[PDB]
Structures are given as structure tokens and as C-alpha cells.
Write a protein that binds this ligand. Structure first.
Ligand SMILES: *[C@@H]1O[C@H](CO[C@@H]2O[C@@H](C)[C@@H](O)[C@@H](O)[C@@H]2O)[C@@H](O[C@@H]2O[C@H](CO)[C@@H](O[C@@H]3O[C@H](CO)[C@@H](O)[C@H](O)[C@@H]3O)[C@H](O)[C@H]2NC(C)=O)[C@H](O)[C@H]1NC(C)=O
Lengths: 48, 48
């Protein structure tokens, strides 16, 4: 996880990397906030 | 016909989405879809 060169070294399971382009991992945007949207009702259920 | 569309399908995003527990369970199956990703990438290169 140091840098892309080390990541592609780990992906190839070798310390020397030949010339070329290698697929290593996937980029994904992590979420920032949590959103909850429930109906505005507040009457307690007749469970009791 | 000469070539077909180059499609790359990812394991962890398809089988498990963005679920860490599902990925941890998927690790038990070994390297099945390291093989799958490799095969799809090889087809992609063969098209060019
Ligand atoms: C079963 O019933 C009990 C008792 O309730 C009372 O007696 C019954 C015979 C009926 O006449 C009821 O209408 C009557 O209220 C329930 O206990 C009560 O539950 C309510 C709801 O949570 C409690 O209210 C809260 O209590 C405290 C202050 O005391 C604060 O959190 C709130 O301001 C709110 O008032 C009430 O205190 C409580 N009463 C007693 C005697 O403990 C019980 O919940 C119910 N069973 C089930 C499954 O709901």
C-alpha cells in the first residue's frame, strides 16, 4: 500500500516488473455522511 | 467479424458489492476470480 509501483509489485507476486500496463485494484468514492429519511409520524404503536 | 467489445468484470464489486463481510467470506474460496479477471483481461488484449 506504499505506492502504485509497490502495489503492482505485489499484484504480480514479483519484485521486478516488466514494461507494460497492469490492472492492480479499483478506485471507489467512499461516502461522507449518513442520511436517514423516515415519515414524520410520531404516534406510538398500540403494542402495549 | 474481427473483434468484439472488450468487457472487464470485477469480482468483489459484482459478487459482494461494497460489503466487507461478504469479501471476507469470499476469501475462503481461494483465487477463483483472480483467474476470472485474468481470463477477461486476456480476451481484452486478444481483441486488439
Ligand atoms: C402496561 O401498562 C403499564 C401501566 O400503564 C398504566 O396502567 C394501565 C392499567 C393503563 O391504564 C395504562 O394506560 C396506564 O398508563 C405500562 O406502564 C406505563 O407505560 C407508560 C408508557 O411508557 C409509562 O409512561 C412514561 O413513564 C415515565 C414517567 O413515569 C416517563 O418515561 C414518561 O413521561 C411516561 O409517562 C408509564 O410510566 C408506565 N406506568 C407504570 C405504572 O409503570 C406498560 O408500559 C404497559 N405495557 C406495555 C407492554 O406497554
Amino acid at each position: 500500500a506504499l505506492d502504485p509501483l509497490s502495489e503492482t509489485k505485489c499484484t504480480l507476486k514479483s519484485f521486478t516488473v516488466e514494461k507494460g500496463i497492469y490492472q492492480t485494484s479499483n478506485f471507489r468514492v467512499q461516502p461522507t455522511e449518513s442520511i436517514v429519511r423516515f415519515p414524520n409520524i410520531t404516534n406510538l404503536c398500540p403494542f402495549g | 467479424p474481427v473483434s468484439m467489445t472488450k468487457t472487464s468484470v470485477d469480482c468483489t464489486m459484482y459478487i459482494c458489492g461494497d460489503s466487507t463481510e461478504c469479501s471476507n467470506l469470499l476469501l475462503q474460496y481461494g483465487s477463483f476470480c483472480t483467474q476470472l479477471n485474468r481470463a477477461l483481461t486476456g480476451i481484452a488484449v486478444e481483441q486488439d
